[PDB]
Design an enzyme around this catalytic site. Structure first.
Site, PDB file in Angstrom:
ATOM      1  N   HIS A 120      -1.800   6.562  15.529  1.00 14.91           N
ATOM      2  CA  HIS A 120      -2.088   6.047  14.191  1.00 14.91           C
ATOM      3  C   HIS A 120      -0.850   5.579  13.428  1.00 14.91           C
ATOM      4  O   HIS A 120      -1.004   4.892  12.415  1.00 14.91           O
ATOM      5  CB  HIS A 120      -2.826   7.098  13.364  1.00 14.91           C
ATOM      6  CG  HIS A 120      -1.919   8.030  12.627  1.00 14.91           C
ATOM      7  ND1 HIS A 120      -1.299   9.102  13.234  1.00 14.91           N
ATOM      8  CD2 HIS A 120      -1.519   8.046  11.334  1.00 14.91           C
ATOM      9  CE1 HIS A 120      -0.559   9.740  12.344  1.00 14.91           C
ATOM     10  NE2 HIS A 120      -0.676   9.120  11.183  1.00 14.91           N
ATOM     11  N   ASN A 155       0.330  17.954   5.383  1.00 14.52           N
ATOM     12  CA  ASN A 155       1.620  18.631   5.206  1.00 14.52           C
ATOM     13  C   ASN A 155       1.611  19.670   4.094  1.00 14.52           C
ATOM     14  O   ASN A 155       2.084  20.793   4.324  1.00 14.52           O
ATOM     15  CB  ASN A 155       2.755  17.629   4.945  1.00 14.52           C
ATOM     16  CG  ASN A 155       3.056  16.744   6.135  1.00 14.52           C
ATOM     17  OD1 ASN A 155       3.717  15.714   5.987  1.00 14.52           O
ATOM     18  ND2 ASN A 155       2.570  17.125   7.313  1.00 14.52           N
ATOM     19  N   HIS A 161       7.981   9.055   9.813  1.00 18.53           N
ATOM     20  CA  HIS A 161       6.934   8.401  10.601  1.00 18.53           C
ATOM     21  C   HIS A 161       7.418   8.216  12.038  1.00 18.53           C
ATOM     22  O   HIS A 161       7.647   7.107  12.528  1.00 18.53           O
ATOM     23  CB  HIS A 161       6.536   7.082   9.957  1.00 18.53           C
ATOM     24  CG  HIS A 161       5.708   7.250   8.723  1.00 18.53           C
ATOM     25  ND1 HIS A 161       6.210   7.053   7.454  1.00 18.53           N
ATOM     26  CD2 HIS A 161       4.415   7.620   8.563  1.00 18.53           C
ATOM     27  CE1 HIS A 161       5.258   7.282   6.567  1.00 18.53           C
ATOM     28  NE2 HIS A 161       4.158   7.624   7.213  1.00 18.53           N
TER      29      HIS A 161
HETATM   30  C1  LIG Z   1       6.345  12.148  -1.608  1.00 22.07           C
HETATM   31  C2  LIG Z   1       4.833  12.367  -1.599  1.00 22.07           C
HETATM   32  N1  LIG Z   1       4.145  11.748  -0.435  1.00 22.07           N
HETATM   33  C3  LIG Z   1       3.571  10.524  -0.567  1.00 22.07           C
HETATM   34  O1  LIG Z   1       3.671   9.981  -1.671  1.00 22.07           O
HETATM   35  C4  LIG Z   1       2.944   9.896   0.536  1.00 22.07           C
HETATM   36  C5  LIG Z   1       2.843  10.660   1.703  1.00 22.07           C
HETATM   37  C6  LIG Z   1       3.455  11.893   1.818  1.00 22.07           C
HETATM   38  C7  LIG Z   1       3.400  12.583   3.018  1.00 22.07           C
HETATM   39  C8  LIG Z   1       4.001  13.830   3.097  1.00 22.07           C
HETATM   40  C9  LIG Z   1       4.639  14.344   1.976  1.00 22.07           C
HETATM   41  C10 LIG Z   1       5.242  15.596   2.051  1.00 22.07           C
HETATM   42  N2  LIG Z   1       4.672  13.651   0.827  1.00 22.07           N
HETATM   43  C11 LIG Z   1       4.097  12.441   0.721  1.00 22.07           C
HETATM   44  O2  LIG Z   1       2.255  10.185   2.848  1.00 22.07           O
HETATM   45  C12 LIG Z   1       1.741   8.855   2.839  1.00 22.07           C
HETATM   46  C13 LIG Z   1       2.887   7.815   2.945  1.00 22.07           C
HETATM   47  C14 LIG Z   1       1.171   8.986   4.266  1.00 22.07           C
HETATM   48  C15 LIG Z   1      -0.030   8.078   4.592  1.00 22.07           C
HETATM   49  O3  LIG Z   1       0.191   6.681   4.474  1.00 22.07           O
HETATM   50  C16 LIG Z   1       1.066   8.842   1.545  1.00 22.07           C
HETATM   51  C17 LIG Z   1       2.213   8.671   0.485  1.00 22.07           C
HETATM   52  C18 LIG Z   1       1.414   8.691  -0.650  1.00 22.07           C
HETATM   53  C19 LIG Z   1       1.340   7.525  -1.630  1.00 22.07           C
HETATM   54  C20 LIG Z   1       2.138   6.241  -1.430  1.00 22.07           C
HETATM   55  C21 LIG Z   1       0.385   7.653  -2.819  1.00 22.07           C
HETATM   56 MG   LIG Z   2       0.228   5.466   8.532  1.00 19.58          MG
HETATM   57 ZN   LIG Z   3       0.556   9.079   9.316  1.00 21.05          ZN
END
Ligand SMILES: CCn1c(=O)c2c(c3ccc(C)nc31)O[C@@](C)(CCO)C[C@H]2C=C(C)C
Ligand SMILES: [Mg+2]
Ligand SMILES: [Zn+2]
EC number: 3.1.4.53
Length: 324
Positions: free
Chosen positions: A113, A234, A73
């Site tokens: 964001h 991603n 982030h």
């Molecule tokens: C490891 C798998 N993974 C996620 O679990 C999460 C991701 C995420 C982003 C990129 C990749 C590659 N993998 C991700 O992004 C979030 C943190 C971004 C928006 O708040 C969403 C979070 C998902 C949840 C907690 C259900």
């Molecule tokens: Mg966010």
């Molecule tokens: Zn984000």
């Protein structure tokens, strides 16, 4: 070296722009240079009378307030979401749908964001009785903070890029940016997706095939899910990009899990580096979150997003194939 950077920035309209090279080539300024490039591409400086020095000053201040020491982030993620939103805005099925102010809102919202993200989740901030969670009463703690910081930095010296907007223009832009950024909280994802499904099922178009949006409710919901898609884009990118995003999110998750383990807290899902399955988590991420959303967005703009959905399904199959 700026010659190479300027060449990589020619791809700014393309899915799978190499944002990590641009980060290196720009001296860790991917957000500034990509934002600046996109504003020029869309003629936004002229449309809204944004002085170029003011734009650069704000972008660099904003970029500074992403944490260079947070693995995912950070400003590279911000630049990537800006650029992904910029491509999504240009899809044929949305041509002439959104005003310049709405386009500005969505790109601006994408830029801010995740600003000043500390690298720990909302639930962590709540469970550890953080100042952030205390300020925001446990509700979309991070996302309210990103907004507050993003708007606050407009008041620094020579930073108000919206100085020449009309009063009503600023009012509308401010409300739209807030609605969009609060929609990036995953706690809102299920209801967001349900409305997007409902819109697809009841979809209306114009004579020329472009999506028809009658009212603020429908217009803002499309912009909300658009930026949300870009935030969750991603796994839809070329695999060499996707895998570096996976490396970064998992390192950030592990470092939160370490803190949780130091404090005797239960470790959050996917944050236990001694009990983590990177591959399974990416497959579950795609199966239960990313593909359901992107499949519905593809339906909305059909067939504009077919290649992006194909890539997502190829990447899902690839991560699945690597499960032992
Ligand atoms: C490891 C798998 N993974 C996620 O679990 C999460 C991701 C995420 C982003 C990129 C990749 C590659 N993998 C991700 O992004 C979030 C943190 C971004 C928006 O708040 C969403 C979070 C998902 C949840 C907690 C259900
Ligand atoms: Mg966010
Ligand atoms: Zn984000």
């Amino acid at each position: 070296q700026e010659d190479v950077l300027a060449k990589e920035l020619e791809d700014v309209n393309k899915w799978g722009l190499h944002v990590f090279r641009i980060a290196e080539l720009s001296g860790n300024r991917p957000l500034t240079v990509i934002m600046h490039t996109i504003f020029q591409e869309r003629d936004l400086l002229k449309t809204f009378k944004i002085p170029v020095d003011t734009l650069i000053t704000y972008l660099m201040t904003l970029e500074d307030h992403y944490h260079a020491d947070v693995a995912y982030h950070n400003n590279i993620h911000a630049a990537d979401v800006v650029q992904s939103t910029h491509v999504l805005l240009s899809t044929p099925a949305l041509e002439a749908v959104f005003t310049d102010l709405e386009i500005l809102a969505a790109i601006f919202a994408s830029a801010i964001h995740d600003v000043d993200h500390p690298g720990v989740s909302n639930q962590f901030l709540i469970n550890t009785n953080s100042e952030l969670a205390l300020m925001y009463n446990d509700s979309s703690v991070l996302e309210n903070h990103h907004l507050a910081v993003g708007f606050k930095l407009l008041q620094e010296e020579n930073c108000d890029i919206f100085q020449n907007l009309t009063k009503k223009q600023r009012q509308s832009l401010r409300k739209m940016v807030i609605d969009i950024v609060l929609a990036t909280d995953m706690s809102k994802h299920m209801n967001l997706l349900a409305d997007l499904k409902t819109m697809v099922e009841t979809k209306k178009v114009t004579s020329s095939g472009v999506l028809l949006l009658d009212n603020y409710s429908d217009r803002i919901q499309v912009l909300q899910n658009m930026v949300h898609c870009a935030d969750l884009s991603n796994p839809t990118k070329p695999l060499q990009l996707y895998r570096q995003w996976t490396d970064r999110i998992m390192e950030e998750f592990f470092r939160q899990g370490d803190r949780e383990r130091e404090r005797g807290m239960e470790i959050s899902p996917m944050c236990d580096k001694h009990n983590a399955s990177v591959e399974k988590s990416q497959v579950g991420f795609i199966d239960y979150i990313v593909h359901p959303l992107w499949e519905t967005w593809a339906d909305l703009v059909h067939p504009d997003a077919q290649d992006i959905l194909d890539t997502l399904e190829d990447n899902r199959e690839w991560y699945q194939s690597t499960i032992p």
